[PDB]
């Protein structure tokens, strides 16, 4: 009859919580115990009494992990919780080894078992558990909102007795889930939206939201979907064409990241230099370095009247709906950890196997081994 734990997050700017009241209520109706740190939900407007009314037990950090079989976290747990971990306990949450090397190294010493939410596989059974997608959706939405807030122009075409105003030209650079939602939200607002990505698939998906795919002289892709190794010559050409497309935009929303690497640069000093004063760059890749060379993580800078913003935790801004979706993701994942109220880790199950970063100090993820 398992007891699952949910802590108050500690990472800079983190206001999300791994489980919200309603989802905790169902886990308890389902016959599970839920230990929740004092005030873990307050960042997402879920007070301590809300969790009590859901059948959860609100306790102190340090007491949190006694008798606990499952740690459900948003960001990876700090040292103090890693020391509090018991034998057989499973850590479930984002881990992100490239940004949390020490916490991962520490997790070996205690020899804890961890399944990482970023490694939740992209197969149909795991769709309802896909935390990257849900959180990226929040980020993409807010990226567009912040873009409109920082821009000195209207997004929408406006016509009035005073005259006619063109819609803003927004380009989303990097079209994953965040990119798609950024497109969709800028499009609802009335902006003329353009899309840049190296994948034909991403570009088709951008077109399925009314965006105009930016098509460069050299196609970045070939048959098999393999990305072209571009010559230096070909590389000089893509850059110059993209520099020109980007120069004619009023807003750039950049979202390109690659698991385990610093964010690739999509806006270079020379490209930014060709942006008109008043232009706005909302750099979603700031959390892993930024696609824009001007970006200062966590800040809004303005250089040459180009306003560049590098937000670090957009999910934490939309904390209520971001938490709600994440909780459900974890709840759906708890399928493979809990059976009829019982601690039933299905190690056998692919979702567990693909996403299991560690098993009792043993590191199973290939790339995570290479880095450490």
């Amino acid at each position: 009859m398992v007891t699952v734990a949910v802590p108050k997050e500690r990472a800079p700017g983190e206001r999300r919580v791994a489980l919200v009241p309603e989802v905790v209520a169902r886990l308890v109706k389902g016959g599970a115990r839920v230990r929740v740190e004092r005030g873990a939900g307050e960042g997402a407007y879920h007070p301590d009494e809300a969790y009590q009314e859901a059948g959860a037990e609100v306790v102190e950090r340090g007491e949190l992990l006694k008798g606990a079989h499952l740690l459900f976290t948003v960001q990876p747990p700090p040292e103090d919780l890693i020391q509090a971990l018991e034998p057989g306990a499973i850590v479930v949450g984002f881990v992100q080894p490239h940004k949390n090397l020490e916490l991962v190294r520490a997790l070996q010493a205690k020899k804890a078992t961890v399944i990482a939410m970023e490694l939740i596989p992209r197969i149909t059974r795991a769709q309802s558990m896909d935390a990257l997608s849900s959180q990226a959706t929040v980020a993409g939405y807010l990226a567009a909102i912040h873009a409109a807030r920082l821009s000195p122009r209207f997004f929408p075409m406006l016509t009035t007795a005073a005259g006619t105003i063109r819609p803003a030209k927004v380009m989303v650079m990097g079209v994953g889930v965040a990119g798609l939602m950024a497109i969709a939200t800028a499009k609802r607002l009335g902006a003329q939206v353009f899309a840049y990505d190296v994948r034909k698939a991403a570009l088709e998906q951008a077109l399925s939201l009314g965006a105009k795919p930016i098509e460069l002289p050299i196609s970045a892709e070939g048959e098999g979907g393999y990305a072209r190794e571009l010559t230096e010559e070909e590389k000089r050409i893509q850059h110059e064409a993209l520099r020109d497309h980007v120069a004619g935009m009023d807003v750039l929303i950049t979202t390109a990241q690659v698991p385990g690497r610093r964010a690739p640069i999509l806006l270079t000093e020379d490209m930014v230099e060709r942006l008109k004063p008043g232009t706005v760059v909302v750099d979603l890749a700031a959390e892993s370095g930024g696609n824009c060379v001007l970006t200062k993580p966590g800040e809004v800078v303005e250089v040459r009247g180009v306003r560049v913003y590098g937000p670090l935790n957009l999910p934490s801004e939309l904390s209520v709906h971001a938490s709600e979706m994440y909780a459900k993701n974890l709840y759906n994942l708890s399928s493979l950890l809990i059976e009829k109220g019982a601690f039933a880790p299905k190690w056998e199950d692919e979702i567990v196997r693909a996403a299991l970063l560690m098993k009792e100090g043993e590191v199973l993820h290939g790339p995570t081994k290479a880095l450490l």
Partner: protein, 177 residues
């Protein structure tokens, strides 16, 4: 097992002309086709003929969370017309015609079965409708790359074409009746 049974736009128009309950189920294909405005126009038209019209929105239809919602909202569809599958599933048996528009994986009965790659996906019971009309260009499979037994059911009929061109033609055919 069964068979692929093509239908003309005129044949579909007659089916919709006499339907009492119609459910639109849009997928990625609607979005690629940017057919949301024509689909809305069709829904308006059927309603003005006393047809009870609803939209079933599958949780993973399209290629991003809420893909169908952003497009249908763009086209001007009312939130009260948009039903999620727990509220609309039990209703399918009394649905005279379910018009599937550019959807495949989200209307595949195979997801009920444990062996199939689509197992885990919540199931939309469009196969329990009295008649199904599927709009897709031809033999293109969905994201998951599996074939659809729905397309082979006795009560399923295939309306081949680009989603918006078809819907446009359906509206024109229906306006003549």
């Amino acid at each position: 097992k069964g068979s692929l049974k093509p239908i003309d736009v005129e044949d579909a128009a007659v089916m919709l002309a006499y339907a009492g309950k119609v459910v639109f189920v849009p997928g990625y294909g609607m979005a690629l086709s940017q057919a949301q405005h024509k689909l809305k126009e069709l829904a308006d038209l059927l309603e003005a003929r006393g047809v009870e019209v609803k939209f079933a929105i599958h949780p993973v239809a399209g290629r991003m969370p809420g893909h169908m919602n952003v497009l249908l909202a763009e086209a001007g569809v009312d939130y009260d017309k948009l039903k999620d599958l727990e509220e609309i599933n039990p209703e399918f048996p009394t649905v005279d015609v379910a018009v599937v528009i550019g959807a495949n994986d989200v209307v595949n009965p195979a997801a009920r079965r444990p062996g199939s790659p689509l197992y885990g996906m919540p199931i939309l019971d469009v196969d329990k409708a009295k008649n199904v009309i599927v709009i897709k260009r031809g033999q293109g499979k969905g994201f998951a790359g599996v074939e659809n037994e729905l397309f082979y059911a006795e009560n399923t009929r295939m309306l081949y074409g680009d989603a918006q061109k078809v819907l446009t033609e359906l509206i024109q055919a229906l306006k003549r009746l």
